[PDB]
Design a binder for this molecule. Structure first.
Ligand SMILES: Nc1ncnc2c1ncn2[C@@H]1O[C@H](COP(=O)(O)OP(=O)(O)OP(=O)(O)O)[C@@H](O)[C@H]1O
Ligand SMILES: Nc1ncnc2c1ncn2[C@@H]1O[C@H](COP(=O)(O)OP(=O)(O)OP(=O)(O)O)[C@@H](O)[C@H]1O
Ligand SMILES: [Zn+2]
Ligand SMILES: [Zn+2]
Ligand SMILES: [Zn+2]
Length: 580
């Protein structure tokens, strides 16, 4: 019942009983909270509630200290004092309290519902202590809301991959995509796609009628470590030992590797195809005796670093850390769960508590402030390297419905990269034809991204609005897909292209009609393909977001066809226009 104030670190015996996280607040900060919000329940060693029989007064502003007990105005003894007085709520340490001038920001964080983009803006521009409080509060709210979705029970099993579901009446249904993972009853985790529903299970299990699926929730632990440790700048390389014979394949990053060793943490912005994994793995080659923990949010990102390390690092010194409660198939070519190896590859959620000379945290645009705090709490390192690109996509915020979240507010690292700039920048795209490079360089990179490749003359655009149908909220554009079918009859080298759309439902229609592999933009992040076919599908904030569009067109190595709905983005594509 005694702790440190979330706003000013002062010792206190008070917590707000109305905030979902029950934060400690000192006598001064607690006053500013209760006098300006609906939160009136104050918790101490004992709760601040009227102590007379039958009384239900719990509003601290209507409560008084009589002796050592609390009473309302109708029950207080003649010798009593108001609990709220002199800008202070009575509690222990009433004279050491410092107070804070940021309580207004606390009050907004503590009372918002996380549906507006301004809640996330405030969560990223406040003090460091408030950032943790907002991250914890948001995550709890997100987790509790998962209880709002209905239960799904199998009515019949059509095949090994299709079934008919029964949805609980009185509650909304979750969208059926690869981001919504249900737990079956425990017969493993399942995902559903679109009355027949396509089901994918962790193991091939004989599903029965009556088995049910529940959205996988999770308890939310408190945070203690900052999103970023305080910065330090050193006179020379600290804790690391450079080689003298780094191969020329990695020598262009030597100066950047030196800078990594001169500061506590450093940020690297790497636009698509500019060599992020190459940078990350070369860091180990330049500091060959360093213990390096490579981490990121998704298994796919960690597995991509593993594939890179397999080519260049000693395999006997690598371990992939896979949580015992297995879920998906991870990289399998390293020793598994040998936490003490020199090179450890692990998703954030599964990080062991250990130390390292260097922590590399990849795909930083996808991280949240909760992730960044978890990484600092579990990994004590001499150097932290944050790799990513704030012009790519963030983690979906399931509660946000009003307003768009700009890159500067994705997390603390993206905020630094957007405000003061990244410590390092990989400036040459080696993956994409120059038509793409030139488009995105002007679109999101202030013309700072250079093309190494020539124009391919296989980059095409077509302006075709089509017809927009919907499966709930996921959009479909059958005319746009018909145009693609026509294109394929006349361009047989594209038979091997990957279809990309901003919508799962569109992708599903394309799979059946066109026969091509399909991917959503968001799931295509970190991937590359020779030929890509993109159908914008609709003109929405989702389909026109510049970060998503950047990602979409930068997956292609040789050629891309973009069937567009928005005039602005169509015009900016530096491609050859196709007729019809
Ligand atoms: N790979 C290495 N090559 C050469 N000398 C090394 C190497 N690793 C450690 N040493 C030496 O051994 C000492 C003790 O190692 P230790 O790991 O405890 O220190 P350190 O954390 O790297 O030190 P500092 O941060 O002051 O550089 C180092 O300070 C350094 O002088
Ligand atoms: N600094 C560099 N110097 C020389 N060649 C490089 C450099 N960075 C990357 N390359 C070349 O580009 C190839 C691909 O790099 P990488 O594995 O990082 O993937 P990418 O798709 O280009 O980039 P990213 O991971 O940023 O999307 C490397 O295998 C290497 O041949
Ligand atoms: Zn409160
Ligand atoms: Zn305080
Ligand atoms: Zn009373």
């Amino acid at each position: 019942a005694v702790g440190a104030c979330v706003l000013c670190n002062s010792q206190t015996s008070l917590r707000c009983g109305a905030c979902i996280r029950r934060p400690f607040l000192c006598c001064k900060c607690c006053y500013d909270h209760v006098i300006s919000t609906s939160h009136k329940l104050v918790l101490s060693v004992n709760p601040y509630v009227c102590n007379a029989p039958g009384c239900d007064v719990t509003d601290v502003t209507q409560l008084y200290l009589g002796g050592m007990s609390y009473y309302c105005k109708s029950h207080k003894p003649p010798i009593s004092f108001p609990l709220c007085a002199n800008g202070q709520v009575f509690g222990l340490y009433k004279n050491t309290c410092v107070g804070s001038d940021n309580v207004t920001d606390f009050n907004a964080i503590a009372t918002c519902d996380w549906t507006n983009a301004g809640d996330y803006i405030l969560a990223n521009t406040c003090t460091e202590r408030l950032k943790l409080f907002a991250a914890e509060t948001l995550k709890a709210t997100e987790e509790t809301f998962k209880l709002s979705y209905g239960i799904a029970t199998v009515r019949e099993v059509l095949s090994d991959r299709e079934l008919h579901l029964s949805w609980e009446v009185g509650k909304p249904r979750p969208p059926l995509n690869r981001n919504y993972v249900f737990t079956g009853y425990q017969i493993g985790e399942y995902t559903f796609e679109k009355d027949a529903v396509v089901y994918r299970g962790t193991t091939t299990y004989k599903l029965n009628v009556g088995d049910y699926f529940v959205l996988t929730s999770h308890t939310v632990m408190p945070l203690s470590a900052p999103t970023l440790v305080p910065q330090e700048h050193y006179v020379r390389i600290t804790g690391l030992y450079p080689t003298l014979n780094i191969s020329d394949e990695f020598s262009s990053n030597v100066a950047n590797y030196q800078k990594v060793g001169m500061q506590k943490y450093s940020t690297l912005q790497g636009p698509p195809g500019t060599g992020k994994s190459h940078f990350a793995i070369g860091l180990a080659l330049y500091y060959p005796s360093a213990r390096i923990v490579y981490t990121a949010c998704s298994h796919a990102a960690v597995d991509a670093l593993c594939e890179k390390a397999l080519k260049y690092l000693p395999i006997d010194k690598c371990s992939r850390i896979i949580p015992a409660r297995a879920r998906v198939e991870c990289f399998d070519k390293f020793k598994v769960n040998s936490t003490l190896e020199q090179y450890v590859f692990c998703t954030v959620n599964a990080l062991p508590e250990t130390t390292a000379d260097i922590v590399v945290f990849d795909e930083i645009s996808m991280a949240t402030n909760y992730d960044l705090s978890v990484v600092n709490a579990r990994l004590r390192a001499k150097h932290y390297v944050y790799i990513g690109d704030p012009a790519q996509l963030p983690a979906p915020r399931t509660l946000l419905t009003k307003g768009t979240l700009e890159p500067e507010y994705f997390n603390s690292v993206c905020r630094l990269m957007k405000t003061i700039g990244p410590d390092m920048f990989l400036g040459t795209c080696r993956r994409c034809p120059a038509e793409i490079v030139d488009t995105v360089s002007a679109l999101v990179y202030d013309n700072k991204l250079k093309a190494h490749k020539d124009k391919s003359a296989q980059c095409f655009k077509m302006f075709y609005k089509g017809v927009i149908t919907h499966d709930v909220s996921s959009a479909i554009n059958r005319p746009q897909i018909g145009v693609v079918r026509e294109f394929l009859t006349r361009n047989p080298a594209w038979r091997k292209a990957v279809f990309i759309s901003p919508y799962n439902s569109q992708n599903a229609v394309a799979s059946k009609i066109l026969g091509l592999p399909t991917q959503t933009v968001d799931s295509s992040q970190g991937s590359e393909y020779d030929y890509v076919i993109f159908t914008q599908t609709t003109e929405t904030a989702h389909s026109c977001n510049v970060n998503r569009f950047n990602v979409a067109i930068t997956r292609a190595k040789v050629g891309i066809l973009c069937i567009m709905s928005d005039r602005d983005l169509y015009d900016k594509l530096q491609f050859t226009s196709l007729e019809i």
